[PDB]
Amino acid sequence: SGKSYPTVSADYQKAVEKAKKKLRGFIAEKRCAPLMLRLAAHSAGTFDKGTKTGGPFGTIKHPAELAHSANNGLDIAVRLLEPLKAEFPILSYADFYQLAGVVAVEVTGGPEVPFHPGREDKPEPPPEGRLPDATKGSDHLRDVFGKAMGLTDQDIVALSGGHTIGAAHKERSGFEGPWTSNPLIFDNSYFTELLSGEKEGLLQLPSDKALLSDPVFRPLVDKYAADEDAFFADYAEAHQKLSELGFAD
């Protein structure tokens, strides 16, 4: 909604198509889908709607942005992608990283998130401190996703489901371990696990737990735990919106 996508050349679109295929093979082989999804989200989640600053515009590769404590470990992701990115000099880094996030979801068995090219690489990284804080709750989630990014309550719960793949690392955030028993499979298990309680070996952040006690978020958690198809639909809508923050209006 509200989007007017820019025109790109036929050669640009050719490169998008080829890069999508190469990303599938690379991400599957390297087992790095969750890291690439986190990279795409950290690139995009810095958007502030009031000022029109931050967002998915290639700035995460800058040494100054990688230095941010919230971005611990994402230097690995940027380095992993550099050889492949160099095969597609016509593409912006901004588009490349968002394409990698879309592919991460697809190769782990998730929905096909629509992708539109044309993001420009911008000079100035956003200020530090805009990304969500795992130790806070529902008010904080609405401040970051709602007041800054401009996303809905539905988007917040669906996007939290991205944690269905991957794990935390004590050397990165400090939290440790996977949210699910199948951390390379994109499914609704994040929500099933959140409901069943604190299982041995699995992770729940305070920000995950905040979904369970909020009057708006909880019915969404229940819906996604019962209906994977509904989760996939809402997730695809939310990821597309996140990947396009500040882009094409």
Which residues are annotated as catalytic?
42
Which of 99, 205, 236, 245 touches ligand HEM by CB under 6 A?
A: 205
Which of 58, 125, 132, 246 touches ligand HEM by CB under 6 A?
A: 132
User: What DSSP character marks residue 100?
Assistant: H
Q: Which is nearer to ligand CYN, 189 or 207 (CB)?
A: 207
The answer to whether residue 41 forms part of the interface with ligand CYN (CB under 6 A) is: yes
80: helix, strand or coil: helix
Q: Which helix (H) or strand (E) holds 177?
A: strand 177-178
Q: Which is nearer to ligand HEM, 125 or 161 (CB)?
A: 161
Alpha-carbon gap, residue 7 to 15, rounded angstroms: 14
Alpha-carbon gap, residue 144 to 16, rounded angstroms: 30
The answer to whether residue 60 forms part of the interface with ligand CYN (CB under 6 A) is: no
Question: What CA–CA distances, in Å, run from 222 to 157, 215, 238?
Answer: 11, 12, 18
Q: Which does 167 bind (CB under 5 to 8 A by kind): ligand CYN, ligand HEM, none?
A: ligand HEM
Q: Which region among 34-42, 153-161, 216-224, 239-247 touches ligand CYN (by CB under 6 A)? A: 34-42
Alpha-carbon gap, residue 181 to 216, rounded angstroms: 27
Q: Which is nearer to ligand CYN, 117 or 243 (CB)?
A: 243
The answer to whether residue 159 forms part of the interface with ligand HEM (CB under 6 A) is: yes
Alpha-carbon gap, residue 40 to 98, rounded angstroms: 5
Alpha-carbon gap, residue 79 to 173, rounded angstroms: 19
Question: Which residue ranges make up the site for ligand HEM (CB under 6 A)?
Answer: 34-35, 37-38, 41, 73, 132, 134, 141, 159-160, 162-163, 165-169, 172-173, 175, 205, 207
